[PDB]
Fold this sequence. Notes:
2 copies of one chain form a homodimer. Chain A is an alpha/beta fold. Chain A has one domain (1-471). Chain A is 29% helix and 17% strand. Chain A is built from 13 helices and 18 strands. Chain A has helices at residues 27-35, 49-58, 62-65, 87-94, 111-114, 137-147, 172-188, 254-284, 317-320, 345-353, 367-372, 439-455, 461-467; strands spanning 4-9, 37-39, 42-43, 98-103, 118-121, 161-164, 194-200, 207-210, 292-297, 302-303, 309-310, 324-327, 334-336, 340-341, 384-391, 394-402, 406-410, 418-421. In chain A, strands 5-4-7-1-9-12-2-13 form an 8-stranded mixed β-sheet, sandwiched between helices. In chain A, strands 15-16-17-18 form a 4-stranded antiparallel β-sheet, covered by helices on one side. In chain A, strands 3-14 form a two-stranded parallel ribbon. In chain A, helix 7 (172-188) packs parallel to helix 8. The longest helix of chain A is centred in the middle third of the chain and has 31 residues, at 254-284. Chain A is globular and about 65 Å long. The first copy, chain A, starts with a strand and ends with a helix. The relative contact order of chain A is 0.18. Chains A and B meet through strand 16 and helix 13 of A and strand 16 and helix 14 of B. The complex binds calcium ion (CA) (2 copies) and chloride ion (6 copies). Residues 368-369, 372 of chain B line the site of one chloride ion. It is classed as hydrolase.
Amino acid sequence: KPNVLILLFDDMRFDTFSYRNGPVSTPNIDALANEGTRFDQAMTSTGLCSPSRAAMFTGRWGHKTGLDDNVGLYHSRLSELSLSEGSVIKRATSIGYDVSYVGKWHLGAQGPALRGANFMWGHDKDEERNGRPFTPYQTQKNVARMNAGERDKNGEKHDYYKTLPGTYADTVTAKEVNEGKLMLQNAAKSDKPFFGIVSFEQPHPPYRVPEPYASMYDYKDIKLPKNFGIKRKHKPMAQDDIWWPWHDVSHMSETDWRKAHSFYYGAIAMIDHAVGELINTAKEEGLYDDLHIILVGDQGSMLGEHNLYDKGPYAYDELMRMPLIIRDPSLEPKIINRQVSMLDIAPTLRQWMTLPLDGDEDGRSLLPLMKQGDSADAGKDDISLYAYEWYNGGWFGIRAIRTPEMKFVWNPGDSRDELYDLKNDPYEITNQIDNPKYKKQLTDLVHKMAGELNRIDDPSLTKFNHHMKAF
Amino acid sequence: KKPNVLILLFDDMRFDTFSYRNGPVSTPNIDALANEGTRFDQAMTSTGLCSPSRAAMFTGRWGHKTGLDDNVGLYHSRLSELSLSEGSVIKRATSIGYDVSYVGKWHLGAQGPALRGANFMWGHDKDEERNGRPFTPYQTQKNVARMNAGERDKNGEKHDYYKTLPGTYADTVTAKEVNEGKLMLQNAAKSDKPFFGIVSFEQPHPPYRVPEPYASMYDYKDIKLPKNFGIKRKHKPMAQDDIWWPWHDVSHMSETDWRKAHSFYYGAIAMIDHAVGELINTAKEEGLYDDLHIILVGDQGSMLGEHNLYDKGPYAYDELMRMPLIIRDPSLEPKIINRQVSMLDIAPTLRQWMTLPLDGDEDGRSLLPLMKQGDSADAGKDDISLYAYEWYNGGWFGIRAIRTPEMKFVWNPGDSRDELYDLKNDPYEITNQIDNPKYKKQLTDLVHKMAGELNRIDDPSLTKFNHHMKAFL
Lengths: 471, 473
Ligand SMILES: [Ca+2]
Ligand SMILES: [Ca+2]
Ligand SMILES: [Cl-]
Ligand SMILES: [Cl-]
Ligand SMILES: [Cl-]
Ligand SMILES: [Cl-]
Ligand SMILES: [Cl-]
Ligand SMILES: [Cl-]
């Protein structure tokens, strides 16, 4: 049974890395990408922390697991993923894997340990369950100070970007690396197969890095994209509301937005260092050659595209797209340009590890694509499905279907749907939902979405068929 | 022999405005009904939101049982209609031979009264298709952006808050609803079947829109603002700060704007007092009044700047939670009831009057014993009311409140901050005492009372409550 290592990162965009022709030199990630299978059109399930992680680790959509919002935050109803959901963690433990977990969990206090893992170190490790939702009174005060024209140390805005004191060695990231090194050292001492997860809070906003990462990218040299610095025209109302207090970006200057990029880029450089330290330890311990590796970001993050920061209830590519590398040491490297989903991770682990089934797989194993390339799916529709059921206690019910040339977003809590022509408008600036020139494409996408909601037994199909009755 | 029933239902009508409650508006027709009937002077709504309160009124069950726990048809609620599995008192009355008629605001799903057997004579929902998209307030958003830039609408008004309508009373939706109600009463007098009429007015809801003379009847310059007007909210839950509906941004409101919101609302109350008189005079002219069993109720109150809030939202303040309620049984002597009653008590009261068949649980109680005996019917019983605020237009909050005459405890499970108000010493609910160790005995009492109530109604939030309140259980 093969050794598996997952390197999971929070709110890491698909596009930043040098292997994607992005602005940050990421030699260690690029080397893993070129040794493994690049999923260059990977899509998350939801641009939100807990839902994306539950889908990743269970292999089922939120309507089946119940984990359809963030946990532990104003004003979500949810505290934890049900312990009835053992996830790949309990399934691997059941067949004799030593499972270990380091870092960000965000699926309920103690959750990895309750499912049989060694939860070595992380925020959720010694927390009591059923805590009250964290309510951002301080961030509300801070953003009011920003709107009043105040700034933090050195003119920074610490709800967006911050220079941390000290060095890399003092960071949470370095501690997560060091716990991952200990995990690898301990695994090399056992004959038992191991399944390790190292889950980093970096590079999530607010973008907080020590020197030299804080200053390595000059804000003045940042290239800003075509959808930066735009007013949202004819977009759904949920994109305008201040769900979390830092979504008020009315105080942000162009310099503030540029520093949000430059500090994020420093965080990506720091993550590449962290990946190299773990890969070099895996090599030194003699585990690397047979190590089956997943590197993934749970979703992306908005850096001022459509005038949005962080995440919220919407489907733009900067949030919906995720970086994904799956390295199987038995296979030659390939680049997969067909779309894949976060729902495909658990079936891939299940095939690698011969995990027992614990119910439905709403995705598919990526091994055929890893072995054969895009030709594995020749003749099949190239779609992805995205949901945004909730944002921190706000219900939206959002569903998107994305093809290589178009995206349709159903907003059942609104009157306004979205239709983007990704071939002619890849920056998703122009909502074409009301344009009669796109009636054929809209009709196709509505039918594709109905098929997908039926496939996954989404109970919102009934409302979909009412809203879409003109098709 | 089955009694004729008339319900006069008003949207967002506060408990306190009427002259019979020593309020600032002369309301002689409502006062006369209060003086002839049973005054429920401490009536409480179930939820300060339109569709949940109306579903609880017409079904007699809480929203976790009926499913109707949010507004329907509004950004960004998941709901479109009260399930047709819920016949309500409308289908139950039709099934025993009442001719049921409905006029005006429904807000429980397109065609709903008609689908349940009523003559839906006239109203917004009568000819609407079902399963419509949620109304999303793009224009209100644009309007409030202009207000925040310092703009005003015509004649200095702010039409998301108050507006002088063109024309006369006779041109209004209210007058049309009265004319349909008069036709309903005229037709009822020609039938040998008992009748059940509901006339449900959008007035006096905000934005406060009235024609002359009601628009200028009450001088804004004379308005008395209360002690909790315009204050900075100290140590209150975060949901009271967020701009759920676009007009909740009141940062642009001057004191004069708030006084005009009051004076226009007072005009709307005067206008509905006229409407009530017109319908009561028609019932008298048609020979129906002497035996007519009448309920006058507001679905909830409305905020006029108390705690710096406008309209409604996810919170439990008395100006929203309290509702006006008069129940006139012509066989009984008039009394004033000072013990708390609930919107959940309306359906059981109708059930006793009308001998309605059981269609499931009654989460409230019939008010006939109080109507007959006065407050002493319940001597020895805890005087409590239970309030819920599960959702506000697609925002989940799970709020529960328990109110006694002297205290209120509010559980906000989507927050870390609960509320505790000493209504005896702080009736304006300015000071949140949740963290004050001097109120530990009262907090413990109210947490126990809430635990009893959630258990009684089989609320599935008891699992979470038991965790949040574990220090008290
Ligand atoms: Ca995330
Ligand atoms: Ca109402
Ligand atoms: Cl860090
Ligand atoms: Cl845009
Ligand atoms: Cl295969
Ligand atoms: Cl009117
Ligand atoms: Cl206050
Ligand atoms: Cl009785």
